[PDB]
Paper text:
Consistent with the apparent molecular weight (66.2 kDa) determined by the gel-filtration analysis, AvmM was characterized as a homotrimer, with each monomer adopting a jelly roll fold. The overall monomeric structure comprises of eight main β-strands arranged in two parallel four-stranded sheets, and three small β sheets.
However, we were able to obtain the complex structure of AvmM with the product 2 in a resolution of 2.5 Å. The overall structure of AvmM-2 complex is highly similar to the AvmM apo-form with a r.m.s.d. value of 0.18 Å for 574 Cα atoms. The rigid cis-decalin system interacts with F18, W97, I171, F179 and L182 through hydrophobic interaction, while H108 shows a weak hydrogen bonding with C3 carbonyl group. Furthermore, analyzing the B-factor of AvmM structures indicated that the loop1 and loop2 in chain A are highly flexible, and clear deviations of Y15, K16 in loop1 and E104, H108 in loop2 were observed by comparing chains A between the apo and complex structures. Importantly, the orientation of the docked substrate 3 is highly consistent with 2 in the active site of AvmM-2 complex structure. More importantly, the OH-23 hydroxyl is in a syn periplanar to the pro-R hydrogen at C-24, thus after syn-elimination, the specific twisted 3 would generate a Z-type C23 = C24 double bond. The formation of the 16-membered macrocyclic ring makes 2 more rigid and dramatically changes the conformation of flexible side chain in 3.
Author numbering:
A (entry chain B), B (entry chain A), C (entry chain C): 9 to 197
The structure:
């Protein structure tokens, strides 16, 4: 099996990366956007079970909670579902301010990689995609915010997830999308 | 020489990577989008000739053919051209479902890296871009699809392409862009 | 210290990478766009001072100057500012043709990573983002162009930037976004 690196108290395999497609740099409050995000096994070790976690982060206010946004997703060709508030970590508060809400977006991928027992194994070069629909409620803004993709994997089958609400005991390479929640640019000319 | 990995029977140099810009996460049937894709030599071995391949994949149906979409491209500062249906691979039907249509988008880049003999050598840190205009015919949809970038290179000068229709005898790191072909998100609010 | 590669006479740590979000593949002359770009320490060596450099490149004309566009940005949670032309490199003219304008987008990041003395250290896994507003004046176009992200860092505390107008004495991994400046695609159908 692969060897992990230490970030905080967690193990991280950089061979499991993630990519965003279609995240806008400015999101209008109240408006619904759809984007896709996918994690890909760039290593050679096939993980027996995998799922995506998504973290919503505002750097310049700490009142954001899970309830302030709507979140739906679909794992590859499986059906759409509403992201489960109980499958989230509790709000986390960096010492410099802000807040982030970690949301689990795991599940079978429609029988592409997923297996009849419910596991989503990740062989080399393979990938799992989440199509995501996201909307923040009106009246909430942020001037420096991000979505973060955090691949969760189970090192070995019988291992169990380490953070309550999120999938996995080891994690992949964090990928970022920075955005603003508010109004788009005035014309510079 | 450079190091290859064996996937299927093919040699793959991961140092030749690809990036997408401007791929939407939802594509409207009948509508034309333009995006860009470029492959970059992140390694140190200079390849004597290179060209881009693009793969369109539907995970949830196997009736897609080259004819069901229109595809134009332009290599860096060269002129626009229509992609050649004869420079495509035949339909492929993965066991994990669907069909994919592999398309060659090769050619001189307008004299940036390209040479008078038509070759596009790829030195370290250098990159080649295809600007791509894509439209699917009205009336065809997909709920989980991808565009894939597959950089093709000729290991040795005068080597011959190994997959009929596609450029290259060895290949780079596959890059994915997941999307849906259909209607956009309804308002969550 | 970390390990560098030599590109021209400059030292490059490929471990400091950059990502774009929201760069359109086609930019309309005169119009203002907002995108975000961020650089991340994918290595283990914490850099004592870092700042983003942004290169605007036209491959097919050499008359582009800094005066031909308007450029505003904000480092993470800090406020917007107009990019300083005196904090740009002189126009550079590749031997194959074209021109590129290297612009410094440095500054405190709003107290996230930045320190009271003004430096923006970059620990492992941490990141700095620029939100960018860009507009080209009407009447200049380009059919093959790019934005390039070049993380600039200070190897040792108190080091001096090496290229005039740009931040850093060593640099990170160049990241590209290819686009056209002109009219969007006509309908292919
Ligand atoms: C991911 C895309 C990649 C990896 C590239 O493709 C970059 C390559 C090729 C470019 O596309 C240029 C045709 C066009 C140049 C595009 C970007 C140009 C620079 C960032 C330019 C300014 C800052 C300096 C960075 C240090 C580290 C090297 C020096 C010389 C200089 C650099 C430059 O002068 C470049 C070059 O002379 C050639 N180069 C440069 O970055
Ligand atoms: Cl990643
Ligand atoms: Cl790649
Ligand atoms: Cl690339
Ligand atoms: Cl990737
Ligand atoms: Cl990079
Ligand atoms: Cl010139
Ligand atoms: Cl054009």
């Amino acid at each position: 099996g692969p060897v992990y690196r230490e970030y905080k108290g967690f193990r991280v395999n950089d061979n499991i990366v993630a990519d965003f497609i279609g995240v806008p740099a400015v999101i209008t409050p109240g408006e619904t956007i759809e984007f896709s995000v996918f994690y890909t096994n760039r290593g050679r070790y096939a993980y027996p079970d995998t799922g995506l976690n998504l973290v919503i982060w505002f750097s310049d206010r700490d009142d954001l909670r899970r309830e302030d946004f709507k979140l739906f997703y679909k794992v590859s060709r499986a059906d759409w579902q509403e992201q489960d508030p109980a499958k989230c970590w509790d709000p986390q508060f960096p010492a410099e301010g802000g807040v982030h809400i970690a949301c689990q977006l795991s599940g079978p991928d429609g029988g592409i990689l997923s297996k009849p027992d419910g596991t989503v194994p990740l062989p080399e070069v393979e990938s799992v995609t989440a199509h995501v629909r996201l909307a923040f409620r009106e009246g909430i803004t942020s001037e420096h915010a991000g979505i973060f993709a955090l691949p969760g994997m189970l090192d070995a089958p019988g291992d169990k997830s380490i953070i309550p609400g999120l999938f996995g005991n080891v994690f992949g390479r964090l990928q970022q999308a920075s955005f603003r929640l508010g109004e788009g640019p005035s014309s510079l000319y």
